[PDB]
Design an enzyme around this catalytic site. Sequence first.
Site, PDB file in Angstrom:
ATOM      1  N   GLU A  22      49.494   3.219 -15.181  1.00 24.72           N
ATOM      2  CA  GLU A  22      49.552   1.840 -15.697  1.00 24.72           C
ATOM      3  C   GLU A  22      50.989   1.415 -15.879  1.00 24.72           C
ATOM      4  O   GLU A  22      51.305   0.261 -15.572  1.00 24.72           O
ATOM      5  CB  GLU A  22      48.806   1.774 -17.013  1.00 24.72           C
ATOM      6  CG  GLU A  22      47.301   1.823 -16.865  1.00 24.72           C
ATOM      7  CD  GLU A  22      46.629   0.630 -16.211  1.00 24.72           C
ATOM      8  OE1 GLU A  22      47.310  -0.356 -15.889  1.00 24.72           O
ATOM      9  OE2 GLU A  22      45.396   0.759 -15.929  1.00 24.72           O
TER      10      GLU A  22
ATOM     11  N   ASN B 101      48.913 -11.490 -14.755  1.00 21.20           N
ATOM     12  CA  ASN B 101      47.653 -11.567 -13.965  1.00 21.20           C
ATOM     13  C   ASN B 101      47.471 -12.986 -13.392  1.00 21.20           C
ATOM     14  O   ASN B 101      48.048 -13.952 -13.882  1.00 21.20           O
ATOM     15  CB  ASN B 101      46.494 -11.109 -14.841  1.00 21.20           C
ATOM     16  CG  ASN B 101      46.724  -9.724 -15.417  1.00 21.20           C
ATOM     17  OD1 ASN B 101      47.053  -8.810 -14.687  1.00 21.20           O
ATOM     18  ND2 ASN B 101      46.564  -9.561 -16.710  1.00 21.20           N
TER      19      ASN B 101
ATOM     20  N   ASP C 165      45.041 -14.901 -13.567  1.00 26.68           N
ATOM     21  CA  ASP C 165      44.331 -15.812 -14.505  1.00 26.68           C
ATOM     22  C   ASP C 165      45.291 -16.346 -15.578  1.00 26.68           C
ATOM     23  O   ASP C 165      44.860 -17.130 -16.380  1.00 26.68           O
ATOM     24  CB  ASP C 165      43.107 -15.112 -15.090  1.00 26.68           C
ATOM     25  CG  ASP C 165      43.406 -13.965 -16.027  1.00 26.68           C
ATOM     26  OD1 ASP C 165      44.568 -13.636 -16.168  1.00 26.68           O
ATOM     27  OD2 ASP C 165      42.486 -13.447 -16.625  1.00 26.68           O
TER      28      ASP C 165
ATOM     29  N   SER D  43      46.827 -14.401 -17.857  1.00 21.41           N
ATOM     30  CA  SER D  43      46.951 -13.368 -18.899  1.00 21.41           C
ATOM     31  C   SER D  43      48.067 -12.395 -18.514  1.00 21.41           C
ATOM     32  O   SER D  43      48.562 -12.445 -17.411  1.00 21.41           O
ATOM     33  CB  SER D  43      45.660 -12.634 -19.147  1.00 21.41           C
ATOM     34  OG  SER D  43      45.289 -11.929 -17.989  1.00 21.41           O
TER      35      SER D  43
ATOM     36  N   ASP E   6      49.468  -8.186 -19.102  1.00 18.29           N
ATOM     37  CA  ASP E   6      49.224  -6.819 -19.580  1.00 18.29           C
ATOM     38  C   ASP E   6      50.485  -6.232 -20.193  1.00 18.29           C
ATOM     39  O   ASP E   6      51.562  -6.444 -19.613  1.00 18.29           O
ATOM     40  CB  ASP E   6      48.787  -5.944 -18.432  1.00 18.29           C
ATOM     41  CG  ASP E   6      47.529  -6.359 -17.727  1.00 18.29           C
ATOM     42  OD1 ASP E   6      46.686  -6.968 -18.342  1.00 18.29           O
ATOM     43  OD2 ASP E   6      47.413  -6.035 -16.560  1.00 18.29           O
TER      44      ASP E   6
ATOM     45  N   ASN F 163      45.522  -6.078 -22.077  1.00 18.05           N
ATOM     46  CA  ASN F 163      45.479  -7.474 -21.583  1.00 18.05           C
ATOM     47  C   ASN F 163      45.347  -8.491 -22.714  1.00 18.05           C
ATOM     48  O   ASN F 163      44.484  -8.356 -23.615  1.00 18.05           O
ATOM     49  CB  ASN F 163      44.340  -7.639 -20.603  1.00 18.05           C
ATOM     50  CG  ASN F 163      44.443  -8.935 -19.857  1.00 18.05           C
ATOM     51  OD1 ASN F 163      45.237  -9.090 -18.932  1.00 18.05           O
ATOM     52  ND2 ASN F 163      43.644  -9.876 -20.273  1.00 18.05           N
TER      53      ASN F 163
ATOM     54  N   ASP G 191      34.204  -0.052 -26.277  1.00 17.45           N
ATOM     55  CA  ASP G 191      33.671  -1.414 -26.019  1.00 17.45           C
ATOM     56  C   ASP G 191      32.480  -1.367 -25.050  1.00 17.45           C
ATOM     57  O   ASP G 191      31.854  -2.415 -24.868  1.00 17.45           O
ATOM     58  CB  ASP G 191      34.770  -2.321 -25.479  1.00 17.45           C
ATOM     59  CG  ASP G 191      34.413  -3.788 -25.515  1.00 17.45           C
ATOM     60  OD1 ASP G 191      34.001  -4.258 -26.601  1.00 17.45           O
ATOM     61  OD2 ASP G 191      34.524  -4.437 -24.444  1.00 17.45           O
TER      62      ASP G 191
END
EC number: 3.2.1.17
Length: 129
Positions: free
Chosen positions: A35, A46, A48, A50, A52, A59, A101
């Site tokens: 990562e 990203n 969209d 967003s 990270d 995110n 989650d």
Amino acid sequence: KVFGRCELAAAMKRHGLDNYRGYSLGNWVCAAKFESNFNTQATNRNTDGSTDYGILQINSRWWCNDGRTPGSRNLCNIPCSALLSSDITASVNCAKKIVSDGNGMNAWVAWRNRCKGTDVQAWIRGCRL
Ligand SMILES: [Cl-]
Ligand SMILES: [Cl-]
Ligand SMILES: [Cl-]
Ligand SMILES: [Cl-]
Ligand SMILES: [Cl-]
Ligand SMILES: [Cl-]
Ligand SMILES: [Cl-]
Ligand code: NA
């Protein structure tokens, strides 16, 4: 901060990640390598809008507030900047929420594609833990 492999393994163990939700320490070290290359200051934007953040590339769409991700949540109740600290506590505490989650470590696309099903114990081999 750019961690050494064994340095990061020791810091994640001290923070309760070894076998957290059944994921052995090597999984967490493998995920961080791919990562962020073990760099706490890693950021990536990203498509969209967003971003990270940090060693586990958490995110802003769901997990932290950066003030520039419209309609997003802040489920770890932290500013995204907290995830770039040399102190991994905020990253580890948020990662525990994410892995609980429902999808486990499949939340991390680099883990699913590069660590899952490999010999992850190799990532902690040789370390004094
Ligand atoms: Cl390495
Ligand atoms: Cl392991
Ligand atoms: Cl926002
Ligand atoms: Cl929220
Ligand atoms: Cl905030
Ligand atoms: Cl730390
Ligand atoms: Cl799981
Ligand atoms: Na957010």
